[PDB]
Amino acid sequence: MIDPVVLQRRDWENPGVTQLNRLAAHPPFASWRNSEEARTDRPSQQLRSLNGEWRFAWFPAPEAVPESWLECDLPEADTVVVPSNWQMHGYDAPIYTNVTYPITVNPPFVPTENPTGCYSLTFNVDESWLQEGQTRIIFDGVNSAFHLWCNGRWVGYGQDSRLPSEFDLSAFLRAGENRLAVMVLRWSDGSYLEDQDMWRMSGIFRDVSLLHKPTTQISDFHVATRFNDDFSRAVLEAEVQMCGELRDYLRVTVSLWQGETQVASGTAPFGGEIIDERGGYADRVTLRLNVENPKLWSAEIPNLYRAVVELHTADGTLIEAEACDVGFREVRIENGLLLLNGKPLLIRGVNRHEHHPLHGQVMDEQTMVQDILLMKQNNFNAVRCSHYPNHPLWYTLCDRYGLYVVDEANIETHGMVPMNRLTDDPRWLPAMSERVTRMVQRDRNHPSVIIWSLGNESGHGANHDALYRWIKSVDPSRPVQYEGGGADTTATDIICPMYARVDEDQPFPAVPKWSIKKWLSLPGETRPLILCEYAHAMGNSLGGFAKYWQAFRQYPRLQGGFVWDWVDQSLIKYDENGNPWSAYGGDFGDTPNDRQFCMNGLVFADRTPHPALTEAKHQQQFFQFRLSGQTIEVTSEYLFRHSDNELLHWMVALDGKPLASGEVPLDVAPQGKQLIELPELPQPESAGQLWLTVRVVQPNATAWSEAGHISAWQQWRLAENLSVTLPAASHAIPHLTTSEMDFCIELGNKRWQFNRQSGFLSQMWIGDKKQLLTPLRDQFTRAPLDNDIAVSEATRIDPNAWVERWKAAGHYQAEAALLQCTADTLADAVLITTAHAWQHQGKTLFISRKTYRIDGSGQMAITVDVEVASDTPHPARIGLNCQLAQVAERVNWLGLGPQENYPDRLTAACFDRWDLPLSDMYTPYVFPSENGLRCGTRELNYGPHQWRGDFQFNISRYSQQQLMETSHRHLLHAEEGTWLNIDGFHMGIGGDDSWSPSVSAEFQLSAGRYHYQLVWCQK
Amino acid sequence: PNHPLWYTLCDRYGLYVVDEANIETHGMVPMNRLTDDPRWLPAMSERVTRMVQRDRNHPSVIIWSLGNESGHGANHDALYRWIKSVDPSRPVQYEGGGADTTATDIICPMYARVDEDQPFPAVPKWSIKKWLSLPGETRPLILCEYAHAMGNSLGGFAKYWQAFRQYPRLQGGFVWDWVDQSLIKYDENGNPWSAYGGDFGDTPNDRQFCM
Ligand SMILES: *[C@@H]1C[C@@H](O)[C@@H](O)[C@@H](CO)O1
Ligand SMILES: [Mg+2]
Ligand SMILES: [Mg+2]
Ligand code: NA
Ligand code: NA
Ligand code: NA
Ligand code: NA
Ligand code: NA
Ligand code: NA
């Protein structure tokens, strides 16, 4: 077995040892030996990728690894791609757990059965690399700890899954063929700081590379940009550090480029200013470059310069060059406001994990770019790196596309009891400090990073305070935030709670979540408030999103938040027929697990939007609208840019029929206003409601959007002319036929049947074709949403959860008892009158009283009046349902759409005539629930049927019962015909969080008495 | 940190104590080379945290010190905040990097003179009366070392005390120092004599500067 010191020391069970022989952290290097190549950011011959086909063998523990593996390839090993997580190749199971550690909590110890990945690579090194200078290896991401060997000799050890580990291999390599051996441990003492709510995987999951640096080398460099009061003048200050022999002829030149133009330059020998009694840094120099009228960086306009750092002899010999993109911007908190370039930010943010449904936690350029384009297209301007430093390319892309970044240390100890057990313990300070300090050393030159975060969900400990102060000391250019221990501790510049509600206090002992409006004004409080997590987007969610944005806009110091979160953490599995399906917690034999709680995204794992995404896009719009008469007032919420790629399209329609349209160019200054006078509108021919819709279209393509991109919209009701004309009097009269079992009504080809034992319409005919597969009955329940269920930890139930209260009240079990069923014959109609009581174990929950009026024109008017017992939990819905025999291709409606919308999530929807394929009327949430509702609907058309009134509906091939009984979307089967759920009223979906009741009072069905009417006819 | 009995004796006899972390990197160039280096933060933190954990219940300890002559690095700032957080009962002081940095609650220079400025670059030793009223300065001033008692010395001692008594915010200081670091050697006849640097074959050495 591999030995002796390595297995003896057990460095992976010691928080005092987080590395051996690891090189110092630093900003991204490429060691260009040509300055023009550095400037253009073209590939460097001194930076080689070792990604591709490696050899891999799996072992149950490090003790099981054979000693021979160190010297030569194992025959039993396989050839696999690197980077990769070994769970994704099927070597063992990924584990989904939220809070509870995937291992027994016994710090610093891990299980003796410790899955061990043995990676190896035979590769070539050219003689030229070994004759001179330094050859290092860089592992961007290894999860969670590893020992490294080169050509059979031990090199070093590393921890922290989310930052690069670098080792000098100069003395280990030979010309020609070389062999790396990497023993990766799944569990280590590092795991105690990696308890993020996500899939627990392992392996070499980020890039591996070889870097060649000269012996005399740039070892570090920091770029700062400071400004005068109006940002018309800047000073770029670049501190550069060298390693190697100090020499008088050595120089650094820092040159600043705007495209092909060099805007500034400075050259100096080494030797910093005196700093104390012993002198200064002889191995450092600081260059100061004056920049007049700098082009400022923001998410709105991501202006970048190129800084080239040249290490050279005085007489002109370049030793090496390094470089970075530079964004001129100031981030500061002043008078309680987070300012960027002097202006208060409004953070339209989202948390984003590094997740791919096929490749797990391995990130690629295409996916990153896809994510960024989708975020910006949906009006996000900010991302939180939940909850670890990201793949290095992410920051480069955020610099270039323009997104504000919160860079977050890889520290989460959520499963500890209490949460701060390790973070208050000075014995864990060393391991914690490296996760903070090495992040700052790596990422401090990226303009996109505007805020540092100390980690996530690790309570508040003294270690947090120490590292807070370390950051403030080494980098005063960026605020520091941290949510743990109450979101407003001494370790944060920003009040940054998770799931604090807008108006409602949640006064938990020790760590209350105050109403965000209340929080700001607590005695002595002065800081800005930006939620690190809010609007939990789990399944059918984002109810109440508009309430946050209204408050964000009204309150200066409420400066936004980061939605939780971007993308469902579902993984692809394959069934017996090789068909892909989306899996969640427990689907890999992983146990214990927290099931679907890993799926909280605005988008599906494949980046298909959830309906909630449009709600986010709309509330995060950068243009605000008001209407007065026929004048539209457009207000810009851009801070820096003019509206130079925007036109306003307007449209007036009468119940879906276009009356007039037109367009006006937008010419709005940042924070400015523009008045748009609409032309005189034509008088409507018919009766009904006029609707004005405006939309902001971007005529030109950008780096992040296509030509014609819609960025903003708004609707208003204009004039309404109420119909005062009586329908044409029909000559025909429907006939009533009575039996003991049934009332049958006939009118031409049309027939209705009411069952006298049940009291419901049991059948209808058009021609002599039956229309119903299941009778039309009241429905007071929905297939529970993730929010209704309100579970965040599989073993924990909130008795106050809506699903728990509905179940215990017997809402799902309640049986309809007939009280009345009579028939009457009027002058031109047959009138059926019914009353029902729903009861559970002697308690009447609901009473439904109806009339059905069928006239000579063939229309059936259903009037429904419902009583709900005041002491039963408010019902999910008050409506009717039936299974129609007809399966049609299209659904046509006049109401809110086109996408799924609910009462507390309908601001993004527009009133119009919508026409979709039936399949679009179902939302494929991975965990199935009530879905696909559209609200404020006045007319619905499906095949031969038309329903009219003022209702909410959903329509699909899946019953509420099936949705309720099915755990995974791939297990759903289309039922015979089409299930129609038509509601007079429907409860909000909530989502302020998904583990407690979160539906606001105004969206609960608490009125006790409810009235609605539907007219059912043939089209 | 001293032998544990020292604090017990200071508690019982009555002496105010500045308990100081075992951190001095005077010989580094510049002096803060290690203390501004995040890789040395772990080793440094233990010298501070384990001192606090040991001595925090002693009433005689009234002030914590982050060490001596190690310039001023970001590691001092972090450890300053660590103490402030874990023990709000005692001020934290530290002289390195100019005696009035963000890592000290007390302006605590060594060998700053009463009336005479010593305007060294980066780390000046202002007149103590002047130091107090520099623009924005509010802290008390207590010299961590003053009146260097080397051989025939302590000239001008009365000047310090006159100033300490006149100025409220001049709250005294700690003389350097208590006892000559001389060692006993024996001559050919076995008679004892007082030895200093260099007398043991030790080289390089700084001779009598230990006394
Ligand atoms: C905040 C922390 C994050 O990692 C998630 O656990 C989220 C709930 O899904 O809460
Ligand atoms: Mg360890
Ligand atoms: Mg967590
Ligand atoms: Na605001
Ligand atoms: Na989650
Ligand atoms: Na425009
Ligand atoms: Na379900
Ligand atoms: Na005094
Ligand atoms: Na001395």
Side-chain angles (χ1 to χ4, degrees):
Chain A
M1 60 176 178
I2 68 103
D3 239 45
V5 58
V6 162
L7 268 197
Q8 201 158 345
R9 276 289 172 100
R10 300 187 78 81
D11 293 305
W12 62 91
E13 291 189 307
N14 180 3
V17 172
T18 55
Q19 58 85 18
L20 297 162
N21 304 317
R22 182 158 73 187
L23 297 171
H26 56 79
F29 285 164
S31 190
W32 283 284
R33 310 301 166 82
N34 179 285
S35 301
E36 185 58 23
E37 299 305 290
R39 185 188 73 81
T40 55
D41 205 42
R42 282 194 292 266
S44 174
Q45 287 290 296
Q46 291 67 233
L47 179 56
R48 274 180 60 194
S49 179
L50 292 178
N51 294 349
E53 304 184 339
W54 284 51
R55 299 281 290 164
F56 177 90
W58 185 98
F59 292 94
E63 292 88 352
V65 183
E67 190 180 8
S68 63
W69 167 75
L70 299 184
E71 292 284 352
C72 63
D73 193 65
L74 281 160
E76 329 91 53
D78 304 310
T79 299
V80 309
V81 170
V82 160
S84 59
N85 295 104
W86 76 63
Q87 294 74 32
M88 300 299 91
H89 296 162
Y91 291 97
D92 63 22
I95 298 158
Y96 173 61
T97 179
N98 171 11
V99 174
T100 303
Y101 280 101
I103 58 170
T104 309
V105 187
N106 189 24
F109 306 105
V110 302
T112 58
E113 293 165 72
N114 187 356
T116 299
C118 290
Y119 294 78
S120 57
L121 180 69
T122 307
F123 65 107
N124 184 74
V125 176
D126 199 84
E127 174 69 54
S128 63
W129 278 46
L130 304 174
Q131 285 172 229
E132 62 195 57
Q134 172 193 50
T135 302
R136 78 177 68 193
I137 187 156
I138 301 161
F139 294 87
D140 280 326
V142 184
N143 184 347
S144 66
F146 71 105
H147 279 288
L148 173 72
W149 292 263
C150 186
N151 293 323
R153 290 176 55 207
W154 183 75
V155 179
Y157 176 75
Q159 292 183 192
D160 190 350
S161 302
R162 302 283 171 160
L163 284 171
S165 288
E166 305 173 25
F167 307 93
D168 195 342
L169 303 177
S170 296
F172 289 88
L173 295 169
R174 56 174 174 260
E177 272 177 298
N178 293 272
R179 185 161 174 277
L180 301 168
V182 194
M183 188 184 71
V184 182
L185 303 147
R186 180 166 196 175
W187 312 120
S188 70
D189 58 81
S191 299
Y192 285 100
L193 311 178
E194 305 183 346
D195 192 38
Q196 290 88 344
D197 179 10
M198 64 182 189
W199 287 100
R200 315 309 172 94
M201 295 185 193
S202 51
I204 304 180
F205 74 103
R206 287 186 187 159
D207 295 334
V208 182
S209 53
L210 281 183
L211 174 64
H212 191 272
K213 298 270 272 169
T215 302
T216 300
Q217 57 176 239
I218 295 157
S219 50
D220 200 6
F221 69 98
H222 309 155
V223 178
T225 57
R226 294 182 303 269
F227 303 89
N228 64 350
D229 57 5
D230 63 7
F231 297 88
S232 72
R233 301 189 59 171
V235 171
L236 186 154
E237 180 165 289
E239 176 190 296
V240 183
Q241 314 176 8
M242 69 160 280
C243 286
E245 296 292 321
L246 293 158
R247 300 277 166 70
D248 295 356
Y249 59 71
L250 286 171
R251 301 283 187 278
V252 174
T253 297
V254 173
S255 305
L256 189 69
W257 300 77
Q258 166 84 71
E260 307 302 294
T261 316
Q262 189 189 79
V263 305
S265 198
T267 303
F270 282 93
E273 60 187 21
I274 299 162
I275 69 158
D276 55 50
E277 295 85 347
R278 296 287 283 166
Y281 287 92
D283 53 343
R284 301 185 188 179
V285 57
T286 298
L287 289 298
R288 284 175 201 87
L289 314 187
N290 289 324
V291 183
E292 307 304 300
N293 306 114
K295 302 203 90 186
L296 304 176
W297 184 93
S298 67
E300 306 182 17
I301 313 164
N303 294 305
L304 290 176
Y305 292 69
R306 189 76 168 167
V308 177
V309 185
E310 289 171 295
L311 181 61
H312 63 95
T313 66
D315 293 337
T317 303
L318 183 73
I319 295 159
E320 73 168 345
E322 296 294 358
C324 71
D325 300 330
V326 175
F328 282 77
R329 88 290 177 269
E330 184 196 79
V331 189
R332 80 183 198 266
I333 295 171
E334 183 166 66
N335 204 34
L337 295 168
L338 173 66
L339 306 180
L340 193 118
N341 300 333
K343 306 288 180 197
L345 287 179
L346 176 47
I347 298 299
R348 298 155 164 88
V350 66
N351 292 263
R352 175 189 174 277
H353 270 284
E354 291 180 322
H355 176 85
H356 193 280
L358 302 166
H359 306 306
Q361 294 168 357
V362 178
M363 269 298 107
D364 63 274
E365 186 159 5
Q366 184 170 284
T367 302
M368 286 184 189
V369 169
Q370 181 181 33
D371 278 341
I372 291 173
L373 300 188
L374 277 173
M375 284 156 72
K376 289 185 71 72
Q377 282 163 20
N378 288 278
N379 296 325
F380 293 88
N381 65 4
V383 62
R384 176 175 175 221
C385 295
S386 53
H387 303 285
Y388 40 74
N390 275 30
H391 182 295
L393 185 58
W394 182 248
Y395 307 91
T396 293
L397 298 172
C398 289
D399 291 345
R400 291 173 182 179
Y401 283 105
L403 285 176
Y404 305 122
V405 175
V406 178
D407 206 4
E408 185 151 287
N410 182 26
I411 308 162
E412 166 151 12
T413 70
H414 202 164
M416 295 305 302
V417 178
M419 214 189 303
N420 81 344
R421 185 169 287 272
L422 306 182
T423 62
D424 203 43
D425 182 349
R427 311 272 304 186
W428 285 84
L429 180 53
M432 281 173 70
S433 77
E434 290 200 345
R435 290 159 180 264
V436 170
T437 62
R438 298 173 74 243
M439 171 189 59
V440 174
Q441 290 181 303
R442 191 189 72 161
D443 299 342
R444 63 178 298 159
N445 296 335
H446 286 289
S448 63
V449 181
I450 62 160
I451 298 164
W452 300 114
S453 169
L454 299 170
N456 184 67
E457 292 176 317
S458 307
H460 176 241
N463 299 356
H464 286 122
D465 289 329
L467 299 174
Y468 167 84
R469 184 54 193 143
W470 184 90
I471 303 178
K472 304 289 283 179
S473 184
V474 306
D475 181 25
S477 78
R478 295 172 175 98
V480 184
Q481 74 167 48
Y482 178 62
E483 178 278 344
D488 63 0
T489 65
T490 54
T492 189
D493 292 331
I494 297 164
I495 307 163
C496 56
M498 56 173 81
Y499 318 104
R501 296 174 187 192
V502 177
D503 299 307
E504 197 192 347
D505 287 343
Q506 302 169 80
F508 307 119
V511 283
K513 301 181 189 302
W514 305 115
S515 150
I516 61 176
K517 293 180 201 176
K518 171 181 175 162
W519 211 323
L520 290 176
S521 52
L522 294 183
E525 189 56 70
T526 59
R527 287 169 288 190
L529 192 158
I530 302 170
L531 297 113
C532 73
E533 298 162 56
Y534 82 115
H536 200 252
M538 185 180 185
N540 192 354
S541 191
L542 243 78
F545 198 67
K547 197 178 292 183
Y548 279 100
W549 285 88
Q550 193 276 325
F552 296 161
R553 287 183 172 101
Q554 184 182 11
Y555 283 64
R557 282 168 58 218
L558 292 186
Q559 292 183 263
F562 298 82
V563 171
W564 187 273
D565 65 349
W566 182 243
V567 58
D568 280 345
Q569 291 185 62
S570 60
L571 290 171
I572 294 299
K573 281 183 72 85
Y574 297 96
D575 67 23
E576 53 180 36
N577 301 319
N579 294 312
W581 55 274
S582 295
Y584 51 81
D587 289 338
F588 291 92
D590 49 309
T591 183
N593 72 84
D594 290 303
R595 304 282 157 192
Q596 70 259 45
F597 199 65
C598 59
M599 301 182 308
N600 317 139
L602 296 166
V603 304
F604 289 103
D606 72 8
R607 273 65 179 177
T608 299
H610 292 177
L613 186 57
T614 188
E615 192 79 357
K617 175 176 182 177
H618 178 63
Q619 285 302 318
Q620 292 166 176
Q621 279 165 194
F622 292 88
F623 297 98
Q624 304 299 299
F625 309 90
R626 295 214 313 270
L627 173 70
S628 189
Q630 289 197 338
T631 311
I632 303 159
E633 187 196 61
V634 189
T635 302
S636 171
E637 286 187 330
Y638 282 111
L639 306 170
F640 314 112
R641 67 177 296 272
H642 186 90
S643 66
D644 58 20
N645 184 25
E646 276 92 1
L647 58 78
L648 190 83
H649 185 257
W650 66 268
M651 162 72 79
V652 179
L654 182 72
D655 294 335
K657 302 166 278 170
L659 263 292
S661 67
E663 62 182 63
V664 182
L666 279 190
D667 186 49
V668 200
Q671 312 288 286
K673 294 181 170 190
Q674 184 187 334
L675 301 166
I676 294 160
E677 191 85 359
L678 288 177
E680 196 182 324
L681 294 171
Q683 295 162 41
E685 300 291 292
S686 176
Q689 177 74 69
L690 287 172
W691 286 87
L692 168 65
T693 307
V694 304
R695 78 215 318 140
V696 179
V697 179
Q698 297 176 181
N700 309 301
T702 64
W704 55 272
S705 61
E706 287 180 299
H709 176 79
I710 301 170
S711 67
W713 65 92
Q714 189 58 258
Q715 262 198 332
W716 297 265
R717 291 174 191 267
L718 298 181
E720 180 172 42
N721 295 301
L722 296 169
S723 181
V724 287
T725 56
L726 297 87
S730 190
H731 302 100
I733 306 159
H735 179 253
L736 174 63
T737 295
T738 302
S739 72
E740 187 192 27
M741 276 302 301
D742 293 306
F743 293 124
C744 286
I745 307 159
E746 195 186 20
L747 184 89
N749 57 354
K750 293 165 205 181
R751 292 168 59 207
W752 297 262
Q753 180 179 320
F754 294 80
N755 183 284
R756 292 180 75 183
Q757 178 176 302
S758 71
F760 300 113
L761 177 76
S762 59
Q763 196 54 262
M764 297 195 323
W765 292 266
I766 297 164
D768 217 70
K769 264 75 188 177
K770 49 165 274 170
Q771 299 300 310
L772 303 180
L773 293 170
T774 309
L776 180 71
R777 296 163 64 92
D778 305 72
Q779 188 177 225
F780 304 104
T781 54
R782 67 183 173 200
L785 317 177
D786 279 317
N787 290 342
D788 294 340
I789 295 164
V791 168
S792 59
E793 295 179 54
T795 62
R796 287 174 81 265
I797 297 161
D798 186 352
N800 298 316
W802 281 105
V803 79
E804 291 308 302
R805 297 215 289 138
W806 293 326
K807 271 153 54 196
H811 285 206
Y812 293 96
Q813 314 288 68
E815 216 153 45
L818 187 66
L819 309 174
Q820 189 192 342
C821 185
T822 53
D824 272 302
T825 316
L826 305 175
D828 69 324
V830 181
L831 188 67
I832 312 296
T833 307
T834 68
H836 291 87
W838 278 262
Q839 294 164 309
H840 180 70
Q841 291 171 11
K843 165 72 178 174
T844 299
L845 303 171
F846 323 109
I847 296 168
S848 172
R849 295 189 176 90
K850 305 188 206 62
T851 55
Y852 305 72
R853 195 189 182 275
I854 304 169
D855 62 27
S857 67
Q859 302 192 120
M860 175 177 52
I862 313 165
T863 305
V864 188
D865 293 279
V866 170
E867 294 189 68
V868 183
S870 70
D871 61 338
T872 200
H874 307 320
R877 47 150 49 97
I878 293 168
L880 308 168
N881 83 319
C882 61
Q883 186 179 10
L884 306 163
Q886 169 94 35
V887 176
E889 295 169 344
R890 312 293 296 186
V891 179
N892 177 287
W893 77 104
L894 187 70
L896 297 170
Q899 298 179 60
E900 175 192 283
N901 60 89
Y902 284 80
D904 55 350
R905 201 198 71 223
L906 56 67
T907 70
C910 293
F911 186 94
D912 219 307
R913 174 73 56 183
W914 305 109
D915 191 294
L916 295 188
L918 175 60
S919 61
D920 282 358
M921 307 305 288
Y922 154 74
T923 308
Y925 294 115
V926 178
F927 175 84
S929 67
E930 152 71 36
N931 74 87
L933 200 81
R934 270 77 170 172
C935 296
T937 295
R938 311 305 300 270
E939 182 197 305
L940 168 69
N941 302 293
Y942 187 64
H945 307 286
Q946 186 180 84
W947 300 266
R948 289 182 292 104
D950 186 16
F951 59 85
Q952 350 303 326
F953 76 95
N954 70 49
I955 193 167
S956 77
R957 307 288 306 274
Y958 317 109
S959 62
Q960 295 294 291
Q961 193 188 347
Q962 192 188 167
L963 295 168
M964 197 182 311
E965 286 168 354
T966 315
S967 63
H968 290 73
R969 67 177 189 183
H970 80 282
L971 291 185
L972 292 164
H973 61 263
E975 291 175 49
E976 204 194 345
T978 310
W979 280 95
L980 171 74
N981 298 292
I982 295 201
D983 298 329
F985 307 85
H986 198 108
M987 190 177 105
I989 61 180
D992 279 359
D993 62 68
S994 304
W995 48 93
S996 65
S998 61
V999 180
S1000 196
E1002 69 274 25
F1003 295 108
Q1004 292 172 37
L1005 308 181
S1006 64
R1009 283 158 303 284
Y1010 285 91
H1011 173 94
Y1012 66 101
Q1013 172 174 282
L1014 301 164
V1015 178
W1016 193 331
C1017 62
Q1018 194 201 344
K1019 201 178 190 284
Chain B
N2 278 28
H3 185 293
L5 184 58
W6 180 249
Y7 309 87
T8 297
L9 298 179
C10 292
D11 294 346
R12 288 170 188 179
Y13 285 101
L15 284 181
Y16 306 122
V17 178
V18 181
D19 203 11
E20 187 153 278
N22 182 22
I23 312 172
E24 172 158 357
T25 71
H26 202 159
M28 293 306 299
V29 177
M31 213 189 301
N32 80 344
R33 185 170 287 271
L34 305 183
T35 65
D36 202 44
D37 181 347
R39 310 200 88 190
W40 284 85
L41 178 56
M44 280 178 66
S45 76
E46 288 197 346
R47 286 158 187 264
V48 167
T49 65
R50 295 173 77 246
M51 173 191 60
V52 170
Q53 294 177 304
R54 193 191 69 164
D55 298 342
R56 62 180 294 168
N57 298 331
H58 283 293
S60 65
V61 176
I62 58 152
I63 293 160
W64 301 113
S65 173
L66 298 176
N68 189 66
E69 293 173 320
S70 309
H72 176 232
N75 299 353
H76 291 118
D77 290 336
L79 294 175
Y80 167 85
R81 184 61 208 152
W82 184 86
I83 304 177
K84 297 295 280 184
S85 173
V86 309
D87 181 21
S89 83
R90 300 172 177 92
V92 180
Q93 77 171 50
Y94 180 63
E95 178 279 344
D100 66 354
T101 67
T102 48
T104 190
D105 294 328
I106 299 168
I107 308 159
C108 55
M110 54 173 82
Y111 317 108
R113 300 183 181 186
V114 177
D115 300 304
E116 181 188 17
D117 288 344
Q118 300 163 78
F120 309 116
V123 284
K125 300 187 192 296
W126 301 117
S127 154
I128 62 180
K129 304 166 167 183
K130 167 178 179 163
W131 211 321
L132 285 179
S133 48
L134 293 184
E137 185 57 71
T138 61
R139 290 167 285 181
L141 192 160
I142 305 169
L143 299 112
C144 72
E145 298 160 60
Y146 81 111
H148 198 252
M150 180 180 187
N152 195 351
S153 192
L154 237 76
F157 195 69
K159 191 175 290 186
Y160 278 98
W161 283 90
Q162 193 281 332
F164 298 159
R165 294 191 169 99
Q166 192 181 5
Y167 285 64
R169 280 172 55 218
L170 288 183
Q171 297 183 259
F174 300 84
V175 174
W176 188 274
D177 63 356
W178 180 244
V179 53
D180 280 350
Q181 292 188 60
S182 58
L183 293 170
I184 289 150
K185 287 181 77 69
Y186 302 90
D187 65 16
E188 53 185 21
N189 304 323
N191 296 301
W193 55 274
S194 288
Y196 54 80
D199 288 338
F200 292 89
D202 52 309
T203 178
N205 71 80
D206 289 306
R207 301 288 187 90
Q208 68 262 46
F209 201 63
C210 57
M211 300 183 297

